[model samples]
Target: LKESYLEESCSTITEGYLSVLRTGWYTNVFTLEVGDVENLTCADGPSLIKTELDLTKSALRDLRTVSADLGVATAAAVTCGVAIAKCIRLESEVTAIKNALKKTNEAVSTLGCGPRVLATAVRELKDFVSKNLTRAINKNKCDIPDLKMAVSFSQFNRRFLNVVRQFSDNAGITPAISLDLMTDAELARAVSNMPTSAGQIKLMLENRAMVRRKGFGILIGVYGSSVIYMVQLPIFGVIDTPCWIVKAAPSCSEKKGNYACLLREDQGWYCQNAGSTVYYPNEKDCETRGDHVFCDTAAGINVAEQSKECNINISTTNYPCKVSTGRHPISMVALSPLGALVACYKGVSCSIGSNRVGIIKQLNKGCSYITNQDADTVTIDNTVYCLSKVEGEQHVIKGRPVALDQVFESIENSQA
Candidate 1:
């Protein structure tokens, strides 16, 4: 389970990091030539890209921590099952061996009243059985399976019950069969009914009322009784068996393709293009080797062979580079023509129509541009004001020096 989980977790993290690799800063901005750099300003570009990189690193760290925690839980559960299985075998052997030792001692006792030679031999054998053999057998009998199971339950219950009560109170739900205070039988039954996987978790969420209503009645009173026979004794056997190991667990291996599959009782099985070569979400045999279009609207329908549009090629796709103009200015800065425009070029007085909004700063990098308060203007209580000799980077468009304001009405204005 640890190996399987690590592989999935690692794949997820890789995909996340790969997305960061394909950002505009890496693919377009850094690849610009001298001519290209002349038309754009680095308003806040460096800090924005730097922030994205930092977020990517933080997400990677969080994924690693989650994977590490899952591995620890899996290891603990496996070790517990192994110890209990060992106890089962040891108990059988100890019972048989101790019974045979008792028979041998009794047989030797009958021959104790004999001649000195015979009597001395009987005394030696009897002392060996009574002392050494008895001690050896008794060593294995320190705790029976019943006692071991109880002690184990006691230890787990004492440590975990507090958390369970907290959930009960917060969720406004009462546990049908309380792990907080459960008998050996109740614990066995609860374990048998427990869901241990993502699919089972989904089922439990849908059928929560079957186990217990929202803090209203005895949790699982009827439901628990009905399933009591589901787990027959050798209670340890039932308790230790997780849902994934059960024969009846739902599987998504029937379909084969380059798709991530999910199973729903209402919708059957559906798979979407994973967009990469990897094993299917829950099924290892299903491989997504050849790429295919993803099922954008294919929930409840199986589209293993066909679906919506997919990328032509991931590595070849390039998003055009964008200048960092920070954020949009106020809402009053309309981007319509025949209205009016304002510019904040050094030592120039520009006026916009009163009906018109504020200025929009246009630079290079296609339709992308910046909008906000220009370095020359300030609004005082809904009134417009301007300053001369603005101090900021000068933008260049087609060999001409440009100001901090240029609004794109459409592609024509964008080109201009």
Candidate 2:
């Protein structure tokens, strides 16, 4: 019986064992068995032995009273279970909040704000939570739903607030960040991180590539195509000049070495060949017959070999002027400064007047000569003289001159 008491106490240490045995065997049996034995006569003789058992029953009563502590320990086990569940719930809420903040940050970056703006937002949110929300959490007054809302609101508010702060900080400055103020690094990063949207990324890219206000007068590319670009130049008597598209070159044919017909603003359509010469179609339909001329070359025919009536004699048929005498009228002549006719004699010495004067005579013998005899200036007998100024400082003439005085004056002013 004494061995049974020790075995029951060790075996019933589990709560499940206590549940199955309501009035536990170890606590109740020890006292009842010992008392019955002690009170019984030894079966008249056994009854005498039973009385001795009853006397030892006090030790069993002590064991039963001590077993009640197991109930208190069971209550503590239940309390620990409740604590574990609460911790899991709180941890789940924390994870959810962190994910929400991450998504919010990604959305803000897509809006095209810079790193500095994002940093400012993070700082503001941390401060708001540390000062206002952390106190509530510490006091155990903050509910999970309330904490979630606070985090979301803080994220939203910080994103836009930081943007506004950055704008204000840079406002009214000469080189301020404006619509077109984004740099290449900022643009590349923005593009790489851009959210998938139609015009959202495009508009941001345009803003970054735009010419700044101070760089208004400079040329800049629009979009990604080089063919599309703009230039803003400050012109006289104009305010807020608009950006204009200036053609860099004519759109030529795709075929190799093919000529393209381009129309000038003042002139009609003409073909520009691979050789860069402006060519006009010939009357005989021969492409090779056309003249290869520069941009400023005047349109004209070679009429010198056509007819004798168009020819003009240029010399007086004398000794010093003998070499200037020619049967055909000179359509074009180049003379040197020392009274030598340069072109009429193929650059050979000819008796021409000083100061590089060209003389034109009549092709028809009957054409009358009208000379300003008193002034030593003669009207040509048949031919006409057309004078044009050359481009540089030299006195020689070339193609038809545009703004002759302006060109000469600019050169003279520079030298002066």
Deviation in angstroms for 35 in model 1?
89
Model 2: per-residue Cα lDDT over 115-223, one tens digit each: 2111000233334334544443443332334545445534534432343333334431222233323335533343434333444334334433321221121111111
- Clashes (backbone N, CA, C under 3 Å), per candidate, total 5, 18
What is the Cα-based lDDT of residue 342 in candidate 2? 17
- Cα lDDT, all candidates: 0.23, 0.23
lDDT of model 1 at residue 329?
21
| Model 2, backbone clash pairs (residues 3+ apart or across chains), number | 18
Off by over 4 Å in 1: 1-168, 174-178, 181-188, 191-311, 314-416
Error of 2 at 155 (Å): 19
